[PDB]
Amino acid sequence: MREIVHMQAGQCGNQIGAKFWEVISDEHGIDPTGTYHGDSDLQLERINVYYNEATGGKYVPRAVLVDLEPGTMDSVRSGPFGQIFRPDNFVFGQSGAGNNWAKGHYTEGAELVDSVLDVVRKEAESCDCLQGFQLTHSLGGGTGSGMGTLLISKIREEYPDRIMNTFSVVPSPKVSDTVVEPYNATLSVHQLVENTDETYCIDNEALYDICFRTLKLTTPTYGDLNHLVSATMSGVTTCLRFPGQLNADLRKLAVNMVPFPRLHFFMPGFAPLTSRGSQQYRALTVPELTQQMFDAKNMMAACDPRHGRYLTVAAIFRGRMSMKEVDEQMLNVQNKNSSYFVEWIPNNVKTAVCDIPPRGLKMSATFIGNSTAIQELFKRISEQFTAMFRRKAFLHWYTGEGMDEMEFTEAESNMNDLVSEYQQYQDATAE
Amino acid sequence: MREIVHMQAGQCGNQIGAKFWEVISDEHGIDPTGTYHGDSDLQLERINVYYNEATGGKYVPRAVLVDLEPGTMDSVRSGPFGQIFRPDNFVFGQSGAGNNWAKGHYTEGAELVDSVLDVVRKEAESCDCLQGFQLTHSLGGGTGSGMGTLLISKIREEYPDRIMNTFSVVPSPKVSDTVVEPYNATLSVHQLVENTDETYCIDNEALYDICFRTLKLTTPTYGDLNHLVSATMSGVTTCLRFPGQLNADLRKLAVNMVPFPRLHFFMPGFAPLTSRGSQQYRALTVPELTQQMFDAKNMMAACDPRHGRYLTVAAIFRGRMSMKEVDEQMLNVQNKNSSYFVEWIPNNVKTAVCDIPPRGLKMSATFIGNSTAIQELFKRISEQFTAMFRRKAFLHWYTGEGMDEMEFTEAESNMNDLVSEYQQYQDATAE
Amino acid sequence: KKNIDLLALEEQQFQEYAGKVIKHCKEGERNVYPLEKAAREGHGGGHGPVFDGKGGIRPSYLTNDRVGVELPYYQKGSTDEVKYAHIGKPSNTRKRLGFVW
Amino acid sequence: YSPEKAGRSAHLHAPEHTFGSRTKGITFDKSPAPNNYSLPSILGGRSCVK
Amino acid sequence: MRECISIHVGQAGVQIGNACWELYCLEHGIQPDGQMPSDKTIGGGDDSFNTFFSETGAGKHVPRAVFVDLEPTVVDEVRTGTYRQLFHPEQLITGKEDAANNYARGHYTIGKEIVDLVLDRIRKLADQCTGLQGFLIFHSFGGGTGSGFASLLMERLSVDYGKKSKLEFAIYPAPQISTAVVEPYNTILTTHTTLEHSDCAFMVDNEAIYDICRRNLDIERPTYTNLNRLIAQIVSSITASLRFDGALNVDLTEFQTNLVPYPRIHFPLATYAPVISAEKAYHEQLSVAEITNACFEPANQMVKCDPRHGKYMACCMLYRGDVVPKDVNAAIATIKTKRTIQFVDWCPTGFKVGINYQPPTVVPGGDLAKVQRAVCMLSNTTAIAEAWARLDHKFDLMYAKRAFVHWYVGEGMEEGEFSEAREDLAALEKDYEEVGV
Amino acid sequence: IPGPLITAKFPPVKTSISLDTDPMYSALGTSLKQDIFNGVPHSHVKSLYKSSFTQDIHNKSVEVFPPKFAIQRNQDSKWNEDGVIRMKLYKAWDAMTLERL
Numbered sequence A, B: 001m002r003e004i005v006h007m008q009a010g011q012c013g014n015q016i017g018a019k020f021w022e023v024i025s026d027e028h029g030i031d032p033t034g035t036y037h038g039d040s041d042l043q044l045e046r047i048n049v050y051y052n053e054a055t056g057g058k059y060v061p062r063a064v065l066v067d068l069e070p071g072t073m074d075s076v077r078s079g080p081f082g083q084i085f086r087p088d089n090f091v092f093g094q095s096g097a098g099n100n101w102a103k104g105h106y107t108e109g110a111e112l113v114d115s116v117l118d119v120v121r122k123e124a125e126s127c128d129c130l131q132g133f134q135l136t137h138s139l140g141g142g143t144g145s146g147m148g149t150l151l152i153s154k155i156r157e158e159y160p161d162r163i164m165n166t167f168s169v170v171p172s173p174k175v176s177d178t179v180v181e182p183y184n185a186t187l188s189v190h191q192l193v194e195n196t197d198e199t200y201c202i203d204n205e206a207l208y209d210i211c212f213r214t215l216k217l218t219t220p221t222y223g224d225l226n227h228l229v230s231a232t233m234s235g236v237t238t239c240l241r242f243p244g245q246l247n248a249d250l251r252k253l254a255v256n257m258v259p260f261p262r263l264h265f266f267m268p269g270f271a272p273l274t275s276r277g278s279q280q281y282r283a284l285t286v287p288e289l290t291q292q293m294f295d296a297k298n299m300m301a302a303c304d305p306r307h308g309r310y311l312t313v314a315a316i317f318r319g320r321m322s323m324k325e326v327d328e329q330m331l332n333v334q335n336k337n338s339s340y341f342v343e344w345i346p347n348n349v350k351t352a353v354c355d356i357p358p359r360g361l362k363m364s365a366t367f368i369g370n371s372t373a374i375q376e377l378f379k380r381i382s383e384q385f386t387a388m389f390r391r392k393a394f395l396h397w398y399t400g401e402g403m404d405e406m407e408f409t410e411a412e413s414n415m416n417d418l419v420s421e422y423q424q425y426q427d428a429t430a431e
Numbered sequence C: 001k002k003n004i005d006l007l008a009l010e011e012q013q014f015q016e017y018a019g020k021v022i023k024h025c026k027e028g029e030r031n032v033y034p035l036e037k038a039a040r041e042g043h044g045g046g047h048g049p050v051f052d053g054k055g056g057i058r059p060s061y062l063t064n065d066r067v068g069v070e071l072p073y074y075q076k077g078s079t080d081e082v083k084y085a086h087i088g089k090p091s092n093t094r095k096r097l098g099f100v101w
Numbered sequence D: 001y002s003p004e005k006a007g008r009s010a011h012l013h014a015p016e017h018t019f020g021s022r023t024k025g026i027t028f029d030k031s032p033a034p035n036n037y038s039l040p041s042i043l044g045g046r047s048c049v050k
Numbered sequence E: 001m002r003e004c005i006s007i008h009v010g011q012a013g014v015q016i017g018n019a020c021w022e023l024y025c026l027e028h029g030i031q032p033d034g035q036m037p038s039d040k041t042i043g044g045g046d047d048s049f050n051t052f053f054s055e056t057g058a059g060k061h062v063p064r065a066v067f068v069d070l071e072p073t074v075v076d077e078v079r080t081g082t083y084r085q086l087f088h089p090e091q092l093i094t095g096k097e098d099a100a101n102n103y104a105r106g107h108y109t110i111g112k113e114i115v116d117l118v119l120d121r122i123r124k125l126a127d128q129c130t131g132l133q134g135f136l137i138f139h140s141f142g143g144g145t146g147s148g149f150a151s152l153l154m155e156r157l158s159v160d161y162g163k164k165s166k167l168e169f170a171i172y173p174a175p176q177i178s179t180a181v182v183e184p185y186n187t188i189l190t191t192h193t194t195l196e197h198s199d200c201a202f203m204v205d206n207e208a209i210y211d212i213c214r215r216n217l218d219i220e221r222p223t224y225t226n227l228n229r230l231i232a233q234i235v236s237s238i239t240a241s242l243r244f245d246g247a248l249n250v251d252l253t254e255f256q257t258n259l260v261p262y263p264r265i266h267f268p269l270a271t272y273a274p275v276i277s278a279e280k281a282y283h284e285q286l287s288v289a290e291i292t293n294a295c296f297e298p299a300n301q302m303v304k305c306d307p308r309h310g311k312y313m314a315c316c317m318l319y320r321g322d323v324v325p326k327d328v329n330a331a332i333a334t335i336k337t338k339r340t341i342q343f344v345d346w347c348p349t350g351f352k353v354g355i356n357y358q359p360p361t362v363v364p365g366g367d368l369a370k371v372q373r374a375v376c377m378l379s380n381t382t383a384i385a386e387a388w389a390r391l392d393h394k395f396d397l398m399y400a401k402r403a404f405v406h407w408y409v410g411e412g413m414e415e416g417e418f419s420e421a422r423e424d425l426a427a428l429e430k431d432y433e434e435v436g437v
Numbered sequence F: 001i002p003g004p005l006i007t008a009k010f011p012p013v014k015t016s017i018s019l020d021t022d023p024m025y026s027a028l029g030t031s032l033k034q035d036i037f038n039g040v041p042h043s044h045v046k047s048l049y050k051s052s053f054t055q056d057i058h059n060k061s062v063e064v065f066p067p068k069f070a071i072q073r074n075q076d077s078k079w080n081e082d083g084v085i086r087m088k089l090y091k092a093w094d095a096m097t098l099e100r101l
């Protein structure tokens, strides 16, 4: 009866939460009204992980939706699966952060943090285990980043021994889609580094490339991308809800990934992702399932692991499936090329096997790769920040509400320290 | 077989008491005419506490309606459940004296107090063993806060043995609605201290906060506020009317809750007060009932319980439950929130369960807290009164009707004396 | 279930009185529009959908500020048409991303 | 052995409970008062709007 | 919910308000009488009008505009025209004597009288709100009440209302086209006095709209009605995300902080695409790449300044219609491949995008035709320095021997304020050069 | 195709809950109870004694009517019991004659 309090922060956060709750309501067999219409008892045996209890056969999510603009809350309420959400967990403002980390953290937004911590306390001590909290936020927005970082700071101050994963839509390398996004990304990572426990860096351009090259789809919209991110969420927290031959929970995954506390930025990944017409050309077995999951095309982040070294790799396999082949392929990728693998960790693969496949699949897999190749994304964010900061561009907006350049210099000091730490643990030898 | 009379005073007290009789009449299953038409025999098992038999199968409330303006009184008579009172307890006045403690206690009301005491005596020795009286009024006017407290003093010198309840609406900084409210409240608290056994201070500001941010009403008016106050009254004196697993008599609560003879100013509360939209999203259990009891949002006074120390705390549950979990939840609140409790009183929560729930939801529980945060209300009323008194504003009316600055400043002295008594037992060194 | 049926009885008992008064005012040739705006299906002050699955309640989503202010409604027909012109009944995201089984 | 103690993860855990508190709000910025504008004269000599 | 009060001032303000409020009413479905037929038995719960229109409880959608002017002619033309009962007649403020194209007369003598009346009107329309996003002032730098009364309005609004964003649509004087002669004096003065009180200041050149209408809209003889159709489409595409549901919806304060690098430089350029007419939009698909290339085409801007003689400091593109984000990023990347688009040296993240769902609304009689997708692009460039130098040369060349100065002295402003405004715009030119290099 | 937990907390059991309320008490209620206590009232709830200590316990009890390990009376039982009354009487007589003497 371990469980997670889910949190949606920002416009991106509310859309990602809506699609995530849709996909796991479909996973557990729950209609938009909130009633169980599934057939298997395994779909209902562990439902307190994400769902609370209401009057009747209702099943409300244990989610808190936070926004400073009313339009996104309007969309989530009035779209599909809006009936299932509680009206009191819709905590929101009216003015708007306006793409400013300062205006989402220090001024208004710190005016909502008391109410949001009230609701987080509400559904946090309305529990018995509370494995942890989840924040599906975006880096590059005002209330996506500043509000999210403030909430993570307060929640980690109150409950410091609990899993605090974040899903961190990071800025794209090419085509910015936001101007002050290097400022927001640097000043938000500066809080995530010593606040969160684990972070799944997801990139919109990489999701576009997946939905275009692999799944064809030509027009990939946002529902498809959001369903990939939500399927990654299910592939992460599937062994905690469903029985497996060898299951792994959030604490177990965190322990087997991070070797040092400031190394919790990972690579999402899902398999199989094949098109409609290519679904009847490829066999769906363990070898294809692991090679399409280790493919660098399939990397849900925006940095090639070919130039870089894996620290650790998590493979969460799913389905009634043999696992001698699973262990043999986890061995075989390392033995084929251990050059893209740290030699000071001998067997750097954590493996979980769950019995119940995701709804609509026979057998699937999920990738969580702690790599030293993510340092180039952080270096890119740092160089964009200092390029836009040495001329003090877009700085009056942040300094008007109560911070100064000292905080930006501290953020860059921490950022470059983590970049050097990744370089050190990449180039470090065994002896 | 213990009975308490009801005495309504003033416009506020008359409307609140009218709604109180109107919501307990169908709690006991009574016609607007007065005849029984309820479901269970337990509705009529204990009916002599509030009612009297008449000719035929009809019942007359043991209530005296006292107000100086006939408009409020005949509005009460012409309202729903108005044709149930005996038309001999209606004691109207002559003028509209009003918002004037002198035109209450000293003039006008002294010409009516003899008739009111006669009709109260007629209703009082018309029973076998009188337990006590409850009077409903507001400390803003001149009828509720004036000659009503004169009635309180006369009853105290007449029957100096019985339990006394005053459900007093006390002024607020916001929703003030009157300019002589500090004068009336400061003159009325002096009589409320040494002549009552227990008082219930109720804030219109907190009532509006509940009715607008928790019940989500478009038009809150006053019927809804009187419904809240009346539900609190029924939750208090339900153990006299219904059997329970353990019961809480009025004198039992008076013994358990006031430690020292002049600290009987309790702020009430009630749970579950929930919105129509959000009623289907929470289930009804003792744990979340404890939240919605102890929440500062659902406290019927504008005091902040974090700004003080709970001396004693009630939990009068009403429904079908397990009081293993009731008792351990009352333990758990003290175990966690140990800062906001007096350390020289161990387990300062008196709990009871009165089996038969209120009509409607499956469970409820009313709250009576003797917090030290009511000194915010008294300190603010006292400072407003001494702000208006040094310039002697609105004092010529009181001096014309007969007072002096000696009585005004001795009321001020006793009022700050009460503030000092609560500050003494607020946060300090117990040993 | 009895509580849900009581809400349904509440709505069907209010709406006959509302229809009687609306028909009388329409016979008397009034504006009718404030009456028709007040007599909307649902059981709350929100401007949202009726939410027929949850007993037909338009919940009250409120802003945390000095004065409440309800969450508005913005979903039109043309916006929904161009929103679902490419994705096509949003449960089809799963079927579009493979996920056939 | 005394299994009567050590029961945080042993038996079913009843929820430890906090306190609640009120919220203040956004505290909206100032609107510049009804008194602040002195309307131009209408009655008298030459006016500007009438 | 997210309200925006429109502050139409001057003859340009009144005409732009007419041709913009007709678009707003027909886009929200509101009839000229005020009521919405809008099949109210079906649905009718859309509060998409609660940014520009206020309820009455009766179905009357009173707008949120204050048509202020000094001559009675255009305001009385509004009060006589088809949108007569739509506007509250206490919202259409008029004076008696015109400013006669004098900043001094419109700011010191005539403007000092009715500014209190219009500010009380602003107070009523502002506390008849639930949280105000920002005022929108549609004025002209040509001269008169569009430059001096707008000055006094902003100088009072900055003190009265908090931060309270203060968006500007401005009719900038064309490089060679001019209907007046004291246009440089008025433009220098109003730029100097609204430098520290404005947040964004979108200028539009009538010569550039003339070129656009004669080339793309295929109009041989355009006029101010068509010019204000283009301005109305610009402002609708800007504040459509505040009203309508979108995917990457971008409200009023986002594209201020994503577009304005420094508080002194708040002068973006607004470009709309496609501006093609019906007979030629019959002939090709108006896809996302085509309309993005149309916005970045230099002979489609609405101020006659060459963007190739300048550096794009920031660019905020608002796509509107049937638009897919991978096409957005593909078009942006294809734009960024080209080297003749030179973004500024210190801003590599030069783009802020927004996507709104509803296609832009067409008008029955306007020459812009009904498209299913469109772009409004707002860009800060250093290419406005050439326009500022063009008008600076005219101001110095007219102020060298003191032409049309005794009028400003007589109706009130002193001799030195010309020099203060002169050095202020010289400082702005040096600021543009410094942020450009 | 049922399931253990699914059947356990979605029971196909149709009990007999009375709710025999007059359709005038049911209309005077749910009009006070329009926003606060908006639910079907629990008139079926009995007291703890009334619902726990029922005659059905004695009806379904299968205890043997003679408990097979109970002691009997016998032929000298009544005489032995009234012998204690003899002890009281013929010691009180001696005690109170001693009191007199």
Ligand SMILES: Nc1nc2c(ncn2[C@@H]2O[C@H](COP(=O)(O)OP(=O)(O)OP(=O)(O)O)[C@@H](O)[C@H]2O)c(=O)[nH]1
Residues within 6 Å of the ligand: E009, E010, E011, E012, E013, E015, E016, E069, E071, E098, E099, E100, E101, E102, E140, E141, E142, E143, E144, E145, E146, E147, E171, E178, E179, E180, E206, E224, E227, E228
């Ligand atoms: N684009 C556009 N420009 C206009 C319009 N009306 C006026 N203008 C411009 O405004 C400039 C002069 O300002 P006006 O608006 O005509 O006059 P005003 O602002 O009311 O001030 P006064 O001259 O004192 O009446 C002219 O050079 C025009 O170019 C319009 O409807 N559309």
Ligand SMILES: Nc1nc2c(ncn2[C@@H]2O[C@H](COP(=O)(O)OP(=O)(O)O)[C@@H](O)[C@H]2O)c(=O)[nH]1
Residues within 6 Å of the ligand: A009, A010, A011, A012, A013, A015, A016, A097, A098, A099, A138, A140, A141, A142, A143, A144, A145, A169, A176, A177, A178, A204, A222, A225, A226, E247, E248
């Ligand atoms: N994956 C995903 N990305 C989004 C979504 N909405 C916006 N984004 C990205 O996030 C950035 C803007 O963040 P935004 O939602 O405005 O942050 P906020 O203002 O704090 O809510 C843009 O660059 C988009 O590419 C979404 O629904 N899903």
Ligand SMILES: Nc1nc2c(ncn2[C@@H]2O[C@H](COP(=O)(O)OP(=O)(O)O)[C@@H](O)[C@H]2O)c(=O)[nH]1
Residues within 6 Å of the ligand: B009, B010, B011, B012, B013, B015, B016, B098, B099, B138, B140, B141, B142, B143, B144, B145, B169, B176, B177, B178, B204, B207, B222, B223, B225, B226
């Ligand atoms: N809760 C509640 N308060 C009321 C009601 N009517 C009046 N009041 C309060 O009573 C105060 C006025 O006191 P008043 O009734 O005139 O006292 P009186 O002179 O004894 O009649 C006002 O400040 C109101 O806030 C009511 O129906 N409900």
Ligand SMILES: [Mg+2]
Residues within 6 Å of the ligand: E010, E011, E069, E070, E071, E098, E144
């Ligand atoms: Mg004019």
